[PDB]
């Protein structure tokens, strides 16, 4: 019949990429790390543009939007229950297959419980054991205290929402429960304080939009884009919401009125947007400003 587009669909990928934008300054911000004497080249105007083009190409690789996944189902599987071994050992044994040429999501990690029951390791145990034998840079075996509520709120108070997402991505798998909660909590703080600009020109911008659309709370994001003269992205936000919610007041209203461009926001503001009056006032303010520049 009709299938709602996913996060990795090309239409969604193209729209989200345009809403992100390649800022070579931010994508290649001078990092605070060990420094080396920079090299210098004598380049013409054509060569300088070519070098700028390569920086644009390298920016896209760095701005690749991570895939969005649902929470993984907890693993509760028992291979065998040997009652003979019950009570012989007071500590459970964890066995991890450390074969190199095996994907980390296809390794057999089993736990021999003290009761004698052999069971597959849970997701939290599997991620911990993988780091023990196959360490990854930036990932700690024990969960850092940075992910506590107080520590995260401290990061939010410092407008370092990108750092939180970078820390969460390196530590937790995308389908993990902790990964979802940290990302969702980060997104809520962004919307409440209107800090959408922090995630602009970052690979994590697409996830923020995807979270907002699925909760019908793109009211805050739409307001910010209009105030920053991003109507083209603002219209795409409304169109993406209509695509993912065909059976809505705004989606049906758009079809009835054949609204396009700025008219799409007006239909959405009156029908489904909670702060419709604020959006209309914001859109009216921009429209008057644009008209003066036209003359």
């Amino acid at each position: 019949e009709t299938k709602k587009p996913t996060f990795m669909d090309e239409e969604v990928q193209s729209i989200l990429t345009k809403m992100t934008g390649l800022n070579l300054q931010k994508t290649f911000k001078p990092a605070i790390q060990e420094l080396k004497p920079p090299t210098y080249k004598l380049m013409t105007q054509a060569q300088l543009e070519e070098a700028t083009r390569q920086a644009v190409e390298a920016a896209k690789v760095r701005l690749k939007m991570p895939p969005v996944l649902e929470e993984r189902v907890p693993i509760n599987d028992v291979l065998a229950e040997d009652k003979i071994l019950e009570g012989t050992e007071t500590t459970k044994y964890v066995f991890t297959d450390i074969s190199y040429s095996i994907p980390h999501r296809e390794r057999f990690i089993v736990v021999r419980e003290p009761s004698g029951t052999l069971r597959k390791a849970s997701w939290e145990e599997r991620d911990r054991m993988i780091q023990v034998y196959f360490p990854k840079e930036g990932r700690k075996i024990l969960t850092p205290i940075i992910f506590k509520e107080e520590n995260l709120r401290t990061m939010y108070s410092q407008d370092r929402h990108v750092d939180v997402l970078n820390l969460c991505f390196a530590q937790f798998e995308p389908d993990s429960t902790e990964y979802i909660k940290v990302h969702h909590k980060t997104y809520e703080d962004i919307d409440k304080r209107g800090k959408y600009d922090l995630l602009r020109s970052t690979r994590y911008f697409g996830g923020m939009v995807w979270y907002f659309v699925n909760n019908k709370k793109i009211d805050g994001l739409l307001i910010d884009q209009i105030q920053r003269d991003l109507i083209d992205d603002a219209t795409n936000l409304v169109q993406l919401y209509h695509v993912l919610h065909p059976d809505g007041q705004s989606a049906q209203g758009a079809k009835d009125q054949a609204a396009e461009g700025i008219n799409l926001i007006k239909v959405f503001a009156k029908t489904e947007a909670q702060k419709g009056a604020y959006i209309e006032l914001t859109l009216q303010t921009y429209q008057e400003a644009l008209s003066r520049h036209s003359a």
Binding site: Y93, D97, V132
Partner: protein
């Protein structure tokens, strides 16, 4: 060093420090020292529980199946680790010791009951 006869054996090589045991599962010659030269390390075994109350055992199954198919023998403690992992059937000694432990505790219950009842 070319020993007279001998064979490869998958055994545990003790590491760590005093009172901190740690065994590395290696495939070495039978005549080699316990912590001496080995052909290929096939995993690790940490008998001391960690902060999660777990004993970490690593089994390079692809290489373990390779060396066993090349004629490498298995030490008795190694045959129990495989049995605990389910890679091998439970060693008869593990089953037999479980039965002995049950008998030992069963007799302790009878002694405890008599002390409470009689006195």
């Amino acid at each position: 060093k070319a020993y007279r006869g001998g064979h490869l054996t998958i055994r545990l090589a003790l590491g760590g420090c005093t009172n901190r045991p740690f065994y590395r599962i290696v495939a070495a010659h039978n005549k080699c020292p316990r912590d001496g030269r080995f052909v290929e390390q096939l995993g690790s075994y940490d008998p001391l529980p960690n902060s999660h109350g777990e004993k970490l055992v690593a089994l390079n199954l692809d290489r373990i199946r390779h060396w066993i198919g090349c004629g490498a023998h298995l030490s008795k403690p190694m045959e129990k680790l495989l049995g605990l992992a389910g890679f091998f059937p439970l060693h008869p000694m593990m089953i037999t010791n479980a039965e002995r432990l049950r008998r030992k505790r069963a007799r302790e219950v009878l002694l405890a009951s008599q002390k409470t009842d009689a006195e």
